[PDB]
């Protein structure tokens, strides 16, 4: 079997320079649990429709839909 | 060029052909072994040396 190998000078210098997927492979990093690609982009495009924080918008929508 | 001839005889000979079933035979070998079989029947033992070669001789 033929491959490639890296031996870093320290574990900290390995965690600095090594890809996160391959740290997850070796157990040096926990896998980040995000949403999937589609829900991330859908959330972004939903949040594009709000100007500002949306506190005023939420209060107005709540008050007006209360009546 | 008459176009309205009788169409009622269509499928006559295939319909009235007596259906005989395929017989059950051992499979021929496939691929390289079939070329081995052809080489044996054509260039090793030639029992049909009638002039040059007869490949499918009917019973005379």
């Amino acid at each position: 079997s033929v491959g490639f190998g890296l031996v870093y000078n320290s574990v900290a210098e390995a965690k600095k320079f090594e890809p996160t997927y391959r740290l997850v492979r070796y157990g040096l990093a926990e896998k980040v649990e995000k949403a999937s690609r589609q829900q991330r982009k859908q959330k972004k495009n939903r949040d594009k429709k709000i100007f500002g924080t949306g506190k005023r918008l939420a209060k107005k929508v709540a008050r007006r839909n209360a009546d | 060029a008459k176009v309205h001839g009788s169409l009622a005889r269509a499928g006559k000979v295939k319909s009235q052909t007596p259906k005989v079933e395929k017989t059950e035979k051992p499979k021929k070998p496939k691929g390289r072994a079939y070329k081995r079989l052809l080489y044996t029947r054509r260039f090793v033992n030639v029992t049909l040396v009638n002039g040059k070669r007869r490949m499918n001789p009917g019973p005379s």
């Binding site: - | 060029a1 001839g5 169409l7």
Partner: protein, 144 residues
């Protein structure tokens, strides 16, 4: 001097002379007039689906003596009426009146083949289930 001009500066006369005499070929004349698109029912194409209008039985040409069992097919993409030969034993029992057939050409780039007068296409599929496969036993024709 064997006809044609030969001189080094006589390339225009040779080129235009070949361009003029090039039209007497069948294929160049047909391809540059574009008669496959103007005429010749399948508009430059190989196959065409149509709808059967009526089953015909064509008298075969002399000296042959048979009924040729064709169909009259109106093409979907043109509306042109053609006659298409249903090309095996039986197989006219397989088509219908008023269903959809796929037609191909018939071997001779136009030029009605054999003893069939005026038929230059043939039925490859009926209802999309392929007359050869229907004829052997391989497929069953759909009811709709």
């Amino acid at each position: 001097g064997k006809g044609k001009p030969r001189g080094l500066n006589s390339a225009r006369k040779l080129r235009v002379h070949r361009r003029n005499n090039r039209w007497a070929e069948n294929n160049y004349k047909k391809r540059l007039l574009g008669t496959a698109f103007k005429s010749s029912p399948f508009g430059g194409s190989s196959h065409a689906k149509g709808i059967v209008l009526e089953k015909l039985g064509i008298e075969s040409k002399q000296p042959n003596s048979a009924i040729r069992k064709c169909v009259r097919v109106q093409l979907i993409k043109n509306g042109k009426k053609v006659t298409a030969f249903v090309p095996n034993d039986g197989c006219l029992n397989f088509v219908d009146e008023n269903d959809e057939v796929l037609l191909a050409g018939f071997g001779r780039k136009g030029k009605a083949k054999g003893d069939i007068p005026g038929v230059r296409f043939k039925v490859v599929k009926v209802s999309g289930v392929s007359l050869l496969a229907l004829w052997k036993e391989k497929k069953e024709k759909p009811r709709s």
